[PDB]
């Protein structure tokens, strides 16, 4: 679906024909008067008097106010109610094309004795940045691919695997930006979901044993709108 502010916002807003004499809590003007937003998106846009009820919670805003607010955020397809903090829609990212593969290997991770290991392999080729990327039309590099990641094949590890597949499908695993280890810009980097790339030790901090890892990555996934 389109992630453009006006389209996303209109999707979750339901027109209020006769709004009350109460504040819009985005612009702090009354709902029976025009939106207080005065920026560039007003030009030939949403009529400033239009008011809607947002999603399931029903909180009411000038439609223009909520498109302005959404446009000042990440514009990731999800829309948060500023009154009650309910989130509507699905967060997606800018991960470029590639391949995600996984299978089982007959080796136990440190801290998960007598198990097999889920080996995940991500492969992302170089390409041209698209309109969703920081420098549209500029080439982007992709370093260190294929990247190998590991989870134990136990109940919680399989759960993480299901959720990583969803995050991959929502283009959330990788993004295009600046590497933290090299400083290179216009390059494929990890996004907000940590992976373990070191199998038999944790000298890098990205390895095992790590008894908190599975719970930690489940929280990161939930922070990206990916949960069961
Ligand atoms: Cl990276
Ligand atoms: Zn308003
Ligand atoms: Zn609400």
mmCIF file of C-alpha atoms and ligand atoms in Angstrom:
data_model
loop_
_atom_site.group_PDB
_atom_site.id
_atom_site.type_symbol
_atom_site.label_atom_id
_atom_site.label_comp_id
_atom_site.label_asym_id
_atom_site.label_seq_id
_atom_site.Cartn_x
_atom_site.Cartn_y
_atom_site.Cartn_z
ATOM 1 C CA UNK A 1 0.000 0.000 0.000
ATOM 2 C CA UNK A 2 1.119 3.604 -0.484
ATOM 3 C CA UNK A 3 3.134 5.048 2.422
ATOM 4 C CA UNK A 4 2.556 8.673 1.291
ATOM 5 C CA UNK A 5 1.240 10.779 4.187
ATOM 6 C CA UNK A 6 -2.121 11.747 2.735
ATOM 7 C CA UNK A 7 -2.949 8.222 1.539
ATOM 8 C CA UNK A 8 -1.865 6.508 4.739
ATOM 9 C CA UNK A 9 -3.734 8.978 6.934
ATOM 10 C CA UNK A 10 -6.925 8.948 4.858
ATOM 11 C CA UNK A 11 -6.912 5.136 5.120
ATOM 12 C CA UNK A 12 -7.435 5.200 8.889
ATOM 13 C CA UNK A 13 -9.455 8.409 9.328
ATOM 14 C CA UNK A 14 -13.287 8.427 9.265
ATOM 15 C CA UNK A 15 -15.027 11.720 8.509
ATOM 16 C CA UNK A 16 -16.774 13.505 11.384
ATOM 17 C CA UNK A 17 -19.645 15.540 9.963
ATOM 18 C CA UNK A 18 -20.316 17.604 13.131
ATOM 19 C CA UNK A 19 -17.237 17.730 15.365
ATOM 20 C CA UNK A 20 -17.422 18.995 18.951
ATOM 21 C CA UNK A 21 -16.007 22.247 20.314
ATOM 22 C CA UNK A 22 -12.985 20.443 21.721
ATOM 23 C CA UNK A 23 -9.264 20.779 21.005
ATOM 24 C CA UNK A 24 -7.449 19.003 18.272
ATOM 25 C CA UNK A 25 -4.534 17.689 20.384
ATOM 26 C CA UNK A 26 -2.110 17.910 17.459
ATOM 27 C CA UNK A 27 -2.490 21.579 16.526
ATOM 28 C CA UNK A 28 -4.339 22.693 19.710
ATOM 29 C CA UNK A 29 -6.975 24.608 17.736
ATOM 30 C CA UNK A 30 -10.627 23.679 18.204
ATOM 31 C CA UNK A 31 -11.998 20.920 15.991
ATOM 32 C CA UNK A 32 -14.764 23.318 14.840
ATOM 33 C CA UNK A 33 -12.161 25.727 13.443
ATOM 34 C CA UNK A 34 -9.475 25.297 10.797
ATOM 35 C CA UNK A 35 -6.318 23.291 11.357
ATOM 36 C CA UNK A 36 -3.494 25.302 12.904
ATOM 37 C CA UNK A 37 -0.980 23.688 10.508
ATOM 38 C CA UNK A 38 0.550 26.247 8.134
ATOM 39 C CA UNK A 39 3.354 24.348 6.346
ATOM 40 C CA UNK A 40 3.977 23.452 2.741
ATOM 41 C CA UNK A 41 1.655 20.438 2.786
ATOM 42 C CA UNK A 42 -1.315 22.782 3.233
ATOM 43 C CA UNK A 43 -0.857 23.994 -0.305
ATOM 44 C CA UNK A 44 -3.596 22.459 -2.448
ATOM 45 C CA UNK A 45 -4.102 19.805 0.149
ATOM 46 C CA UNK A 46 -6.526 18.480 2.668
ATOM 47 C CA UNK A 47 -9.186 21.070 3.455
ATOM 48 C CA UNK A 48 -8.135 22.446 6.884
ATOM 49 C CA UNK A 49 -11.655 22.162 8.388
ATOM 50 C CA UNK A 50 -12.009 18.418 7.762
ATOM 51 C CA UNK A 51 -12.028 16.316 10.934
ATOM 52 C CA UNK A 52 -11.819 12.563 11.308
ATOM 53 C CA UNK A 53 -11.945 9.803 13.904
ATOM 54 C CA UNK A 54 -8.727 7.753 13.909
ATOM 55 C CA UNK A 55 -8.891 3.948 13.579
ATOM 56 C CA UNK A 56 -10.344 1.814 16.407
ATOM 57 C CA UNK A 57 -9.707 4.239 19.253
ATOM 58 C CA UNK A 58 -11.682 6.968 17.570
ATOM 59 C CA UNK A 59 -9.603 9.925 18.695
ATOM 60 C CA UNK A 60 -10.381 12.989 16.601
ATOM 61 C CA UNK A 61 -8.054 15.277 14.677
ATOM 62 C CA UNK A 62 -8.063 17.676 11.792
ATOM 63 C CA UNK A 63 -7.161 15.422 8.888
ATOM 64 C CA UNK A 64 -4.479 17.913 7.766
ATOM 65 C CA UNK A 65 -2.930 17.892 11.243
ATOM 66 C CA UNK A 66 -2.505 14.156 11.203
ATOM 67 C CA UNK A 67 -0.974 14.114 7.708
ATOM 68 C CA UNK A 68 1.469 16.807 8.861
ATOM 69 C CA UNK A 69 2.313 14.825 11.965
ATOM 70 C CA UNK A 70 2.786 11.573 10.026
ATOM 71 C CA UNK A 71 4.888 13.375 7.419
ATOM 72 C CA UNK A 72 7.250 14.580 10.197
ATOM 73 C CA UNK A 73 7.990 11.011 11.268
ATOM 74 C CA UNK A 74 9.618 8.035 9.585
ATOM 75 C CA UNK A 75 6.743 7.541 7.110
ATOM 76 C CA UNK A 76 7.067 3.761 7.483
ATOM 77 C CA UNK A 77 3.368 2.965 6.824
ATOM 78 C CA UNK A 78 2.347 2.884 10.488
ATOM 79 C CA UNK A 79 0.344 5.716 12.030
ATOM 80 C CA UNK A 80 0.371 6.328 15.768
ATOM 81 C CA UNK A 81 -2.455 7.979 17.693
ATOM 82 C CA UNK A 82 -0.823 10.826 19.722
ATOM 83 C CA UNK A 83 -3.532 10.654 22.369
ATOM 84 C CA UNK A 84 -3.531 6.925 23.258
ATOM 85 C CA UNK A 85 -0.432 5.706 21.286
ATOM 86 C CA UNK A 86 -2.294 2.916 19.446
ATOM 87 C CA UNK A 87 -0.597 2.150 16.119
ATOM 88 C CA UNK A 88 -2.463 1.551 12.863
ATOM 89 C CA UNK A 89 -1.082 -0.031 9.726
ATOM 90 C CA UNK A 90 2.035 -2.060 9.068
ATOM 91 C CA UNK A 91 5.596 -0.790 9.487
ATOM 92 C CA UNK A 92 7.769 -1.625 6.466
ATOM 93 C CA UNK A 93 11.282 -0.642 5.484
ATOM 94 C CA UNK A 94 13.628 0.057 2.567
ATOM 95 C CA UNK A 95 15.592 -3.201 2.417
ATOM 96 C CA UNK A 96 16.773 -3.698 -1.201
ATOM 97 C CA UNK A 97 16.248 -6.945 -3.188
ATOM 98 C CA UNK A 98 18.005 -10.090 -2.135
ATOM 99 C CA UNK A 99 17.596 -13.637 -0.875
ATOM 100 C CA UNK A 100 16.927 -15.125 2.565
ATOM 101 C CA UNK A 101 17.616 -18.842 3.013
ATOM 102 C CA UNK A 102 17.675 -21.124 6.021
ATOM 103 C CA UNK A 103 18.221 -24.741 6.943
ATOM 104 C CA UNK A 104 19.263 -26.890 9.881
ATOM 105 C CA UNK A 105 22.841 -27.920 10.645
ATOM 106 C CA UNK A 106 23.858 -30.768 13.043
ATOM 107 C CA UNK A 107 25.776 -28.564 15.516
ATOM 108 C CA UNK A 108 24.752 -27.113 18.882
ATOM 109 C CA UNK A 109 25.304 -23.479 19.764
ATOM 110 C CA UNK A 110 27.147 -22.595 22.981
ATOM 111 C CA UNK A 111 24.491 -22.483 25.671
ATOM 112 C CA UNK A 112 22.042 -24.717 23.749
ATOM 113 C CA UNK A 113 23.400 -28.219 24.214
ATOM 114 C CA UNK A 114 21.929 -31.223 22.376
ATOM 115 C CA UNK A 115 20.186 -29.087 19.725
ATOM 116 C CA UNK A 116 20.508 -28.452 16.036
ATOM 117 C CA UNK A 117 21.107 -24.929 14.738
ATOM 118 C CA UNK A 118 19.064 -22.866 12.292
ATOM 119 C CA UNK A 119 21.536 -21.294 9.906
ATOM 120 C CA UNK A 120 20.154 -18.217 8.140
ATOM 121 C CA UNK A 121 21.934 -16.869 5.050
ATOM 122 C CA UNK A 122 21.140 -13.406 3.669
ATOM 123 C CA UNK A 123 22.463 -12.468 0.215
ATOM 124 C CA UNK A 124 21.988 -8.918 -1.083
ATOM 125 C CA UNK A 125 23.579 -7.762 -4.363
ATOM 126 C CA UNK A 126 24.645 -4.247 -5.222
ATOM 127 C CA UNK A 127 22.199 -2.035 -7.062
ATOM 128 C CA UNK A 128 20.774 1.422 -7.663
ATOM 129 C CA UNK A 129 19.041 3.294 -4.874
ATOM 130 C CA UNK A 130 15.358 3.789 -5.473
ATOM 131 C CA UNK A 131 13.080 6.659 -4.564
ATOM 132 C CA UNK A 132 12.650 5.308 -1.039
ATOM 133 C CA UNK A 133 16.411 5.483 -0.400
ATOM 134 C CA UNK A 134 18.592 8.380 0.823
ATOM 135 C CA UNK A 135 20.235 9.132 -2.564
ATOM 136 C CA UNK A 136 17.855 7.978 -5.313
ATOM 137 C CA UNK A 137 19.663 6.949 -8.441
ATOM 138 C CA UNK A 138 23.054 6.507 -6.784
ATOM 139 C CA UNK A 139 24.672 3.075 -6.689
ATOM 140 C CA UNK A 140 24.735 1.308 -3.311
ATOM 141 C CA UNK A 141 27.404 -1.125 -2.171
ATOM 142 C CA UNK A 142 26.738 -4.357 -0.289
ATOM 143 C CA UNK A 143 29.607 -5.651 1.829
ATOM 144 C CA UNK A 144 30.190 -9.044 3.402
ATOM 145 C CA UNK A 145 27.371 -10.923 1.668
ATOM 146 C CA UNK A 146 26.355 -13.718 1.996
ATOM 147 C CA UNK A 147 25.940 -13.047 5.732
ATOM 148 C CA UNK A 148 25.469 -16.123 7.957
ATOM 149 C CA UNK A 149 23.351 -15.938 11.136
ATOM 150 C CA UNK A 150 22.408 -18.530 13.741
ATOM 151 C CA UNK A 151 19.550 -19.481 16.073
ATOM 152 C CA UNK A 152 19.107 -22.645 18.112
ATOM 153 C CA UNK A 153 16.422 -24.996 16.825
ATOM 154 C CA UNK A 154 14.278 -24.889 19.946
ATOM 155 C CA UNK A 155 10.773 -23.503 20.512
ATOM 156 C CA UNK A 156 11.814 -19.871 21.004
ATOM 157 C CA UNK A 157 14.373 -19.999 18.177
ATOM 158 C CA UNK A 158 11.766 -21.240 15.712
ATOM 159 C CA UNK A 159 9.506 -18.411 16.857
ATOM 160 C CA UNK A 160 12.242 -15.886 16.172
ATOM 161 C CA UNK A 161 12.709 -17.510 12.761
ATOM 162 C CA UNK A 162 9.016 -17.085 11.893
ATOM 163 C CA UNK A 163 9.187 -13.436 12.899
ATOM 164 C CA UNK A 164 12.443 -12.753 11.030
ATOM 165 C CA UNK A 165 10.796 -14.140 7.884
ATOM 166 C CA UNK A 166 7.973 -11.639 8.348
ATOM 167 C CA UNK A 167 10.423 -8.804 8.996
ATOM 168 C CA UNK A 168 12.311 -9.806 5.833
ATOM 169 C CA UNK A 169 9.039 -9.729 3.882
ATOM 170 C CA UNK A 170 8.320 -6.289 5.386
ATOM 171 C CA UNK A 171 11.803 -5.087 4.203
ATOM 172 C CA UNK A 172 12.941 -4.481 7.788
ATOM 173 C CA UNK A 173 16.074 -6.596 8.189
ATOM 174 C CA UNK A 174 18.472 -4.374 6.227
ATOM 175 C CA UNK A 175 18.446 -0.769 5.125
ATOM 176 C CA UNK A 176 20.610 1.545 3.007
ATOM 177 C CA UNK A 177 22.646 4.072 4.978
ATOM 178 C CA UNK A 178 26.049 4.522 6.635
ATOM 179 C CA UNK A 179 27.995 1.587 8.094
ATOM 180 C CA UNK A 180 28.906 1.953 11.770
ATOM 181 C CA UNK A 181 32.041 -0.163 11.480
ATOM 182 C CA UNK A 182 33.478 1.426 8.297
ATOM 183 C CA UNK A 183 31.736 4.809 7.927
ATOM 184 C CA UNK A 184 30.965 4.019 4.264
ATOM 185 C CA UNK A 185 27.786 5.729 3.070
ATOM 186 C CA UNK A 186 25.295 4.471 0.462
ATOM 187 C CA UNK A 187 25.753 0.897 1.670
ATOM 188 C CA UNK A 188 23.652 -2.022 2.896
ATOM 189 C CA UNK A 189 23.591 -2.114 6.719
ATOM 190 C CA UNK A 190 21.738 -3.907 9.487
ATOM 191 C CA UNK A 191 18.607 -2.139 10.635
ATOM 192 C CA UNK A 192 17.175 -2.480 14.177
ATOM 193 C CA UNK A 193 17.098 -6.286 14.503
ATOM 194 C CA UNK A 194 20.291 -7.826 15.882
ATOM 195 C CA UNK A 195 21.547 -11.134 14.505
ATOM 196 C CA UNK A 196 24.173 -13.526 15.860
ATOM 197 C CA UNK A 197 26.887 -13.983 13.216
ATOM 198 C CA UNK A 198 29.500 -15.695 15.427
ATOM 199 C CA UNK A 199 28.737 -19.366 16.035
ATOM 200 C CA UNK A 200 31.067 -20.816 18.663
ATOM 201 C CA UNK A 201 32.162 -17.802 20.732
ATOM 202 C CA UNK A 202 31.241 -14.205 21.518
ATOM 203 C CA UNK A 203 34.502 -12.305 21.033
ATOM 204 C CA UNK A 204 32.657 -9.872 18.736
ATOM 205 C CA UNK A 205 29.609 -9.369 20.937
ATOM 206 C CA UNK A 206 27.551 -10.846 18.054
ATOM 207 C CA UNK A 207 27.968 -14.441 19.201
ATOM 208 C CA UNK A 208 27.147 -17.118 21.731
ATOM 209 C CA UNK A 209 26.638 -18.002 24.498
ATOM 210 C CA UNK A 210 24.079 -15.288 25.136
ATOM 211 C CA UNK A 211 21.148 -16.348 27.342
ATOM 212 C CA UNK A 212 19.339 -13.037 26.804
ATOM 213 C CA UNK A 213 19.618 -12.908 23.024
ATOM 214 C CA UNK A 214 16.361 -14.589 22.030
ATOM 215 C CA UNK A 215 14.273 -12.423 24.370
ATOM 216 C CA UNK A 216 16.203 -9.324 23.249
ATOM 217 C CA UNK A 217 15.600 -9.906 19.527
ATOM 218 C CA UNK A 218 11.936 -10.694 20.215
ATOM 219 C CA UNK A 219 11.676 -7.236 21.815
ATOM 220 C CA UNK A 220 13.402 -5.621 18.821
ATOM 221 C CA UNK A 221 10.994 -7.379 16.499
ATOM 222 C CA UNK A 222 8.013 -6.163 18.553
ATOM 223 C CA UNK A 223 9.471 -2.638 18.369
ATOM 224 C CA UNK A 224 9.270 -2.969 14.567
ATOM 225 C CA UNK A 225 5.657 -4.102 14.592
ATOM 226 C CA UNK A 226 6.561 -7.772 14.140
ATOM 227 C CA UNK A 227 4.971 -10.019 16.762
ATOM 228 C CA UNK A 228 2.819 -13.100 17.213
HETATM 229 CL CL1 LIG B 1 26.344 -3.584 8.392
HETATM 230 ZN ZN1 LIG B 2 -5.614 20.162 14.376
HETATM 231 ZN ZN1 LIG B 3 -6.268 6.999 20.208
#
